[PDB]
Amino acid sequence: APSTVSPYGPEARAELSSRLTTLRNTLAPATNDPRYLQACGGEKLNRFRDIQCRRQTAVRADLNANYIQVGNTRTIACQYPLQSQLESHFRMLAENRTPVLAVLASSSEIANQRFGMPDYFRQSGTYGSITVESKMTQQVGLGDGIMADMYTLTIREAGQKTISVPVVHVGNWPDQTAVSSEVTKALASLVDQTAETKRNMYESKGSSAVADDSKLRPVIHSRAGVGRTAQLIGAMCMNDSRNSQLSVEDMVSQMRVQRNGIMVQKDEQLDVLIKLAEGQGRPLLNS
C-alpha cells in the first residue's frame, strides 16, 4: 500500500481524481495534434469532435479504434462505427479473429435515427464486398433488470476466411450512466467466458492468431467508446488473476494514454471501479 493510512477513504479519492484530471488535460487533443489520428480523404473519422483516437495505438488508419492493454489484459476499444466505416469495421473483426464483440449502446440509441448508429449486428446485410449474417442465440440477465442479448455474426468476403463473431449486446444501459458493481462484475464475467470459449476453438483448429498479440483481442464499444466501454474494460482487467497489484491509477492512466484522456468519463463510472477495487484489496493510488 502507498501511504494514506486509509486506502479507500475520502482523502485518498480526492487525490486520485486530482491526478486523473491533470492527465485528462495533458491528453486534451489539439487542432491537428500529432498524437491523435487525423481525418484523411475528407471523410469523417471521429463520431465526436472532442473524442479523438490515439495515433500510436490505432488499429487501422480509417477507424477510431485502439489497441489498449491494461496490465496483462489485451483488448480493443472503438467508437460506434459510422455507416461510412462499416465495411472497414467488419474487416477488422475478421482479421482480429474476434473471440467476443461487446456492444454497450442502448437499443433506444441504435433506434434514434439522428444518432447515426447503424444496426449492423442484429440484422443481416451486405456492405461493399463483405456479406455479414446475424443470428440470435442466448439471452442472459445480469441483475437489476439489465439484460444481454447474444448474436453470432458471420463476416464472409470473397478471397478471405469466413469468421464467426460472438456478440454480447446490453441494451438497457442508459447513456452517461453506470450500472451497479454487481451488474458490471457479472457483465465482465460473461464476456470473459465468451471469448474464452471462442479462443479455444481457434487454438483447437491451429490458427496462427494464437501467436500474435495483436489478434484474438475482445473488441468492445459503446457509442463514443470512452464511458461505458471504459467501466467494462476496467472490470475485465480486475477479472484477471494475472493483474494482481495493478492499481486503479494504473488502470485508468493506461486507458487514457492508449486511446484518449476521456476513458471513464463520468464519476459514477469511476466509483464503480473504486468499489470493485475496494472489495479486492486492490490499491487505488500508486507510489
Binding site: 479473429r97 458471420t154 476466411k161 469466413t162 469468421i163 464467426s164 476453438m201 481457434y202 483448429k205 490458427s207
Partner: peptide, 5 residues
Amino acid sequence: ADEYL
C-alpha cells in the same frame, strides 16, 4: 476456406 467455421 471455412477453416474456422
